[PDB]
Amino acid sequence: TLNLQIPSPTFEGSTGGWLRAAEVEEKYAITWTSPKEQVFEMPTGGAAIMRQGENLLYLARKEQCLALATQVKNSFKITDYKVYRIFPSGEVQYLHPKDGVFPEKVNAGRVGVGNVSHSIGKNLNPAQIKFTSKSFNG
Amino acid sequence: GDFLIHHAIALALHTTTLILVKGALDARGSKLMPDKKDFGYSFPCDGPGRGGTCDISAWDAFYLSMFWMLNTIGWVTFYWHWKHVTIWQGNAGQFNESSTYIMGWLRDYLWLNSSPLINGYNPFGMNSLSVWSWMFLFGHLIWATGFMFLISWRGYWQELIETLVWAHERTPLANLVRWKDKPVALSIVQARLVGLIHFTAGYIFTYAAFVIASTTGKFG
Amino acid sequence: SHSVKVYDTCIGCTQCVRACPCDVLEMVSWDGCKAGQIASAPRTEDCIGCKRCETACPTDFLSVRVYLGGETTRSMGLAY
Amino acid sequence: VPQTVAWSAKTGAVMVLSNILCIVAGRYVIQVKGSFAGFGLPELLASTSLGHIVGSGAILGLSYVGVL
Amino acid sequence: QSALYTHHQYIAGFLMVGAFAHGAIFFVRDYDPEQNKNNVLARILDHKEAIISHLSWVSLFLGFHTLGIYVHND
Amino acid sequence: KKVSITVDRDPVATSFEKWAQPGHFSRTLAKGPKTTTWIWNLHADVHDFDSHTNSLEDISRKIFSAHFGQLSIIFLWLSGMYFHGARFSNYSAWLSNPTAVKPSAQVVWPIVGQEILNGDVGGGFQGVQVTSGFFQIWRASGITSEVELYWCALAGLLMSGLMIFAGWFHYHKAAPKLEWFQNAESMLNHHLSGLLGLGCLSWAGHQIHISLPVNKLLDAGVAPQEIPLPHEFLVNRDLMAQLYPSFSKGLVPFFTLNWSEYSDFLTFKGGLNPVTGGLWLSDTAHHHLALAVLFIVAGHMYRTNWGIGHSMKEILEAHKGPFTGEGHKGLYEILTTSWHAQLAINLAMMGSVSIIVAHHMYAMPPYPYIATDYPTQLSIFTHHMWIGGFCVVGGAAHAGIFMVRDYNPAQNYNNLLDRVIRHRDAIISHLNWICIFLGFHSFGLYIHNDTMRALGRTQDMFSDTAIQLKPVFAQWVQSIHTLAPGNTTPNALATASYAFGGDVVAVGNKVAMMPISLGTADFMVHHIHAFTIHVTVLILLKGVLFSRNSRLIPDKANLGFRFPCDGPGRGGTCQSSAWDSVFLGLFWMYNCISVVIFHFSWKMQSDVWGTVQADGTVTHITGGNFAQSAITINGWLRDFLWAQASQVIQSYGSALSAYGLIFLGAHFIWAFSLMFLFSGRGYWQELIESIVWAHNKLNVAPAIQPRALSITQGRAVGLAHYLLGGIGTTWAFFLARIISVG
Amino acid sequence: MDSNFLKYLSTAPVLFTVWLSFTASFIIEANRFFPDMLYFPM
Ligand code: CLA
Ligand code: CLA
Ligand code: CLA
Ligand code: CLA
Ligand code: CLA
Ligand SMILES: CC1=CCCC(C)(C)[C@H]1/C=C/C(C)=C/C=C/C(C)=C/C=C/C=C(C)/C=C/C=C(C)/C=C/C1=C(C)CCCC1(C)C
Ligand code: SF4
Ligand code: SF4
Ligand code: SF4
Secondary structure (H helix, E strand, O other), rough: OOOOOOOOOOOOOOOOOOOOHHHHHHHHEEEEEEOOOEEOOOOOOEEEOOEEOOOOEOOOOHHHHHHHHHHHHHOOOOOOOOOEEOOOOOOOOEEOOOOOOOOOOEEEEEOOOOEEOHHHHOOOOOOOOOOOOOOOOO | HHHHHHHHHHHHHHHHHHHHHHHOOOOOOOOOOOHHHHHOOOOOOOOOOOOOOOOOHHHHHHHHHHHHHHHHHHHHHHHHHHHHHHHOOHHHHHHHOOOHHHHHHHHHHHHHHHHHOOEEOOOOOOOOOOHHHHHHHHHHHHHHHHHHHHOHHHHHHHHHHHHHHHHHHHHOOOOOOOOOOOEEEEEEEHHHHHHHHHHHHHHHHHHHHHHHHHHHHHHO | OOOOEEEEOOOOOOOHHOOOOOOEEEEEEOOOOOEEEEEEOOHHHHOOOOOOOHHHOOOOOOOEEEEOOOOOOOOOOOOO | OOOOOOOOHHHHHHHHHHHHHHHHHHHHOOOOOOOOOOOOHHHHHHHHHHHHHHHHHHHHHHHHOOOO | HHHHHHHHHHHHHHHHHHHHHHHHHHHHHHOHHHHHHHHHHHHHHOOHHHHHHHHHHHHHHHHHHHHHHHHHHH | OOOOOOOOEEOOOOOOHHHHOOOOOOOOOOOOEEEEHHHHHHHHOOOHHOOOOOOOHHHHHHHHHHHHHHHHHHHHHHHHHHHHHHHOOOHHHHHOOOOOOOOOOEEEEEEHHHHHHOOOOOOEEEEOOOOOOHHHHHHHHHHOOOHOOOOOOOHHHHHHHHHHHHHEEEEEEHOOOHHHHHOOHHHHHHHHHHHHHHHHHHHHHHHHHHHHHHHHHHOOOOOOOOOHHHHHHHHHHHHHHHHHHHHHHHOHHOOOHHHHHHHHOOOOOOOOOOOOOOOOOOHHHHHHHHHHHHHHHHHEEOOOOOOOOEEEHHHHOOOOOOOOOOOOOOOOHHHHHHHHHHHHHHHHHHHHHHHHHHHHHHOOOOOOOOOOOOHHHHHHHHHHHHHHHHHHHHHHHHHHHHHHOOOOOHHHHOHHHHHHHHOOOHHHHHHHHHHHHHHHHHHHHHHHHHHHHHHHOOOOOOOOOOOOOHHHHHHHHHHHHHOEEEEOOOOOOOOOOOOHOOOEEEEEEEEEOOOOOOOOHHHHHHHHHHHHHHHHHHHHHHHHOOOOOOOOOHHHHHHOEEEEEEEOOOOOOOOOOHHHHHHHHHHHHHHHHHHHHHHHHHHHHHOOOOOOOHHHOOOOOOOOOHHHHHHHHHHHHHHHHHHHHHHHHOOOOOOOOOHHHHHHHHHHHHHHHHHHHHHHHHHHHHHHHHHHHHHOOOOOOOOEEEEOOOOOOHHHHHHHHHHHHHHHHHHHHHHHHHHHHH | OOHHHHHOOOOOOHHHHHHHHHHHHHHHHHHHHHHHHOOOOO
């Protein structure tokens, strides 16, 4: 659940922020908690000061949010960040970390997607699967 | 001179065959990419990992061999035209004495026979060769334009287009007008193809204008 | 979207998941390797195709493989 | 060529006046160092160097414009 | 005569490049190894390294000495 | 005190051990090669000191000693030029007959027929003609014999030894601490007052006491062997006062401010010396003396141990306004902590100064008999133009390196750097638009003129006999500068240069300098120059401002200054680094400087340089074809490229045949560069796989595994061979043409 | 002689430069004393 009333870091603004596609197609939000007011680099260019307590920030791309998350993780030891997707209708979709546990750590209930049960050298030839809806993995 | 230019032709044929055969036989896979057949005949790369994999597909071998094909037909047609122009003039000894070194080719064939072509129009007037005089320069232009797609690559142009997208969205009286398709830079393979197309068109139009206007100016 | 596959040569080193800028990969439980974990790609609609995961993979020829496919707004990395 | 003059008592008066004006100005405007307390040798050197600079400029200009 | 020779020779270069390109496309899309066991095509693929290395050698041989003779004469 | 000398004694032992360990400076490289890439990496990061260690003190010590090593190499080079002038030159014969003896200070050995390059250069001498202008420099300095050149060569060699010893001493024996290097105010005071000020003062001393009497005797027609030695001019005041009577008055007019007494050897004449075609040496002596006074005055501005002086941090922090936030705050810390920021500023400034040198040195020839030495003029203009362009692009490159590596957003909150980063999109978009506008309304004029002349419509062209584009502002500035003597510079006898207007200064029936008129073609080519410079600025500035992040790659600073890409994703991220922007901007700098030097060569050959004959008419080298031909691309192709290349392609069998060989070889290297530029790494790696199979079949595969060059190295090698080929082609073409016809 | 200096002298660029200069000097002196050898005299 994204609290829209979380205060934002003090930023003077830039031309690198989100465009019309954020208000028309989709927008991303990142929240995190800091122990102090401190200066971080914006992923869109420029320096902003995050406040002590909670911080909510809006970006155009998921990669910008995760770059900011990596920056605050490796420079300020902040790991509680949450990344959401917001649609023009007002629907908020929680994205990261998806089950509360970071993806580099194994969590129960996760099911494997895209796993192939053989080595990469065992894929089928394109001539084998031509004019046929078989996948090249077999 | 004939000996040397046929051995140069043999070089160019063997090298173009090397590129094309190496592309065909490594099309299914190499040590750098053992699963290349899973990626098709044409794809940009496999990323900067494993040392970097620029131009690894067989389509890229076609793309590299196109320059060598242009080079070999250039050498063959240069030889044919210079030998025949010196023979038709009654001056075959000029070819016999000048074709054994490269400066003879540059001076007695390219520089010497360019004079009626580059004088198709001048500050004193114009004549019927002027169109070739235009087309020549036209070729020298578009060939060079091909270089832009073959030397500069995508990420620079994508960041420029991002700045342009911001400029159009923030400009009054123009943000009333909106694109239906998002502007992006040309893809990697597309840019290789477009640079090849401009390069090849410049090659063909430059040499066609030169050969027709030079033969017309000397003999017609 | 791009297609990301993980083959059973994976040793569960979690390097591809740490290298992913778009949170496409995650570690799930497995018994095929000594680490007891395998990479998986449940979120390939967010995959930009950067192949940082393939650069991170230490197994001779890669366990994680990215096949570039249909381009979308997310996969093209468009902030507009 | 702009007219310059040979040395005279007027030249000395202009140089002395410029030096004293620059000494007082250096007392008033120099930020890092009863009114002449803290007055040290580097400040005197700086003020008298500016005094020769200003005096030389004034002497050359007044010789240019005819005041001599 | 100049235009006709130049025209059909450039057409020839384009056609030969296309032949090798569509042969590469055949190897990607249509070559079934299991249907071509110990075939002439399979043995081309099995000594492709020798073929490419000897083409590389003959290209370097020709280029080194042809360019050397031209530069020597220059 | 606050500014003091702090030194560590014997920090690095002098030993040959690390000479036997290539890659010792880098922890990544010190493990030894496993692939050939290592070898390239060893030569690629070696003088990149900040990437080997994080200590600013060690980096600063390495930089100081490497600068000493460069000074040693420059002094050895200068000593070589003096020695080769002393022993292998026709300099005395040139001193006797400057208008008829071609300068030559290189003689080849006879081996394979290359003795043909020892051309008949006059003065009873055979050698390679030199265009560096050293003969004119030595004549201006008063060097009349080759013995003095031998002594100059010895002085250069001794200074080279002193510099290399100082480098070893100040790295290996007594290395200054970081606090010593971080004195910007003291360094600026000493380098403004002592390096530039005392240097100008001592060179003014040499000019007044040595150069002026020797050159006055030379211009009066005295033979160089009958001129008195310089020390005789020093001690015999009567001999000095015979030429300049004010020396009879001594130093009393200086100290009493009776300066007009010195008006006979400190002048403000302007124009050129009619005998030599160079600047009046008295004007240069007043110039260097006035510069000495101004520089010594400027060297007392900055605060040091005593309380007087400006603090540069205070000056920077006081200048801030309503448009600019915190203003210039934080820049002093950047410029006293980052060596790359200082290198960026100084490379940009040195490049701009070199370009200014090229313009001001062709237009106001400062050396005797250098104006009518057309090969020297063309060579030095082109050379300093190229050095300037390279240094400006290097300033952009090292700005990008600072932005990636040394920039800290915490210390840069809402200052000018932060606000520039925060409106980079507006900057780059407006620059992009103005570049497209300049390209259209400058190059499309040439395209329009090509089409109109080809279509037989001469009245529809942009020309002086057609629809006119008059350069009215530059013509007005030329009129002002021609009207200036007696009106806005009332004490100057002549104009600053005759290029603005005036008489035809001619020396030995050759034009030293004449008015350079500006018409429609000059309008079009100056706006072409503006277009090319704005596009180069666009590439370099976009690379600098987007070096850390962009909308495409939000974490670009983590990838570094120099990376090939971020993969085929996001549509393709190829050439996204700031390094690749420098790589493209070097091409565009090449294009810009090439057009600039072509404009110079054609305009000087067509409208300025030539022979003066009876009734005062000037017959120019190409006969004034610039006005009607430089308005079309066809005119540039035919009347400049095709016409003036006749000398380099017919040079075979003559002394200029080396230029023909270099012409062909540079075309070759340029074409060879396109293999690296147009291709990609994966093809070459797979071809290397096949070649490795061939070597493996004979059990001769190397232990160091051969790899294709990296993507960045492929770009760098292609760019290096491209620049070498193009610049060498222009080099050979210019030099052969101007030696033959000028 | 210092073994480390000898090991530096044994590096690939130094030995490459010395060997190629030595080879070039052979070709130069052979062409100085026996010039214009287009052919093997038989
Ligand atoms: C008693 C006081 C006194 C008097 C009467 C003069 C009188 C004069 N001085 Mg003098 N001077 C004085 C005190 C005085 N000075 C002092 C105290 C100093 C400090 C040491 C100077 C230093 C000084 C210098 C250094 C020079 C003079 C000069 C002159 C003469 C000026 C001629 C003219 O029209 O200017 C010229 C008017 C111009 C408009 C020319 C423009 C000058 C340059 C080229 C422009 C530079 C501006 C640049 C573009 C930056 C502007 C851009 C901006 C937006 C940032 C004039 C007779 C000049 C002289 O003797 O010439 C023979 C000269 O060079 N003076
Ligand atoms: C008046 C004093 C003085 C002078 C003349 C210089 C001169 C120079 N400094 Mg410098 N420097 C000074 C004080 C001075 N510095 C102080 C006080 C500091 C500490 C804050 C520094 C810190 C400093 C650094 C960190 C660096 C320099 C560098 C340089 C060189 C710049 C390159 C150049 O143009 O060389 C060409 C100019 C020449 C004059 C060539 C000759 C060189 C010798 C050493 C001149 C010695 C003249 C001598 C004092 C008087 C003898 C002349 C005659 C009477 C016989 C130049 C030699 C750079 C360099 O290249 O270092 C090697 C560099 O990196 N300086
Ligand atoms: C004039 C330009 C030029 C030249 C000389 C070459 C040369 C070469 N290309 Mg190439 N290429 C070029 C342009 C050029 N290319 C362009 C524009 C493209 C399009 C992108 C390609 C695409 C291409 C491909 C795709 C392939 C080649 C291959 C080859 C090689 C075999 C052909 C040959 O003659 O071998 C003989 C070699 C030469 C003539 C090279 C010159 C050797 C010099 C003269 C030796 C002397 C070195 C000198 C002493 C060094 C001193 C330097 C020092 C002072 C600093 C050879 C290295 C093929 C290959 O690798 O085959 C094995 C291959 O697969 N090239
Ligand atoms: C004051 C001059 C100066 C200084 C001190 C530096 C210093 C530095 N630069 Mg910089 N740079 C400069 C000028 C300068 N640069 C200019 C003018 C340009 C524009 C071309 C650049 C462009 C530039 C780039 C693009 C990069 C640097 C980098 C670097 C760093 C490492 C350099 C290194 O290890 O190379 C080691 C030395 C070599 C590899 C030798 C290079 C040999 C050249 C390429 C060929 C020379 C050809 C010769 C002149 C003619 C041959 C012809 C003959 C064969 C016939 C170092 C901090 C690099 C870095 O990582 O910085 C952090 C980097 O990426 N600089
Ligand atoms: C001759 C070859 C050539 C040409 C024409 C161009 C053209 C251009 N380059 Mg480019 N480039 C080239 C080679 C070339 N490049 C090479 C070899 C490199 C390798 C390093 C680069 C690298 C490069 C970079 C890195 C950048 C450019 C930029 C630009 C643009 C500059 C803006 C401009 O001038 O707009 C005016 C357009 C022109 C002058 C093009 C010719 C148009 C003329 C006037 C005629 C128009 C007639 C009309 C369209 C006819 C319509 C007919 C209808 C049937 C279609 C422009 C599109 C810059 C850019 O895009 O930002 C502005 C930029 O940042 N280029
Ligand atoms: C790569 C690709 C993958 C698979 C598909 C693929 C397309 C098959 C393949 C490409 C194969 C590629 C496209 C192959 C392209 C191949 C080349 C172009 C074939 C040329 C053959 C020349 C023949 C042997 C005629 C020779 C003349 C001789 C017999 C004459 C002798 C005599 C005659 C009679 C008369 C007098 C003269 C003398 C000399 C006395
Ligand atoms: S530079 Fe371009 S082609 Fe090369 S690996 Fe990177 S994305 Fe692929
Ligand atoms: S290609 Fe990039 S975004 Fe896609 S899964 Fe791999 S690392 Fe993640
Ligand atoms: S990096 Fe490779 S081996 Fe490691 S977890 Fe990912 S797929 Fe498995």
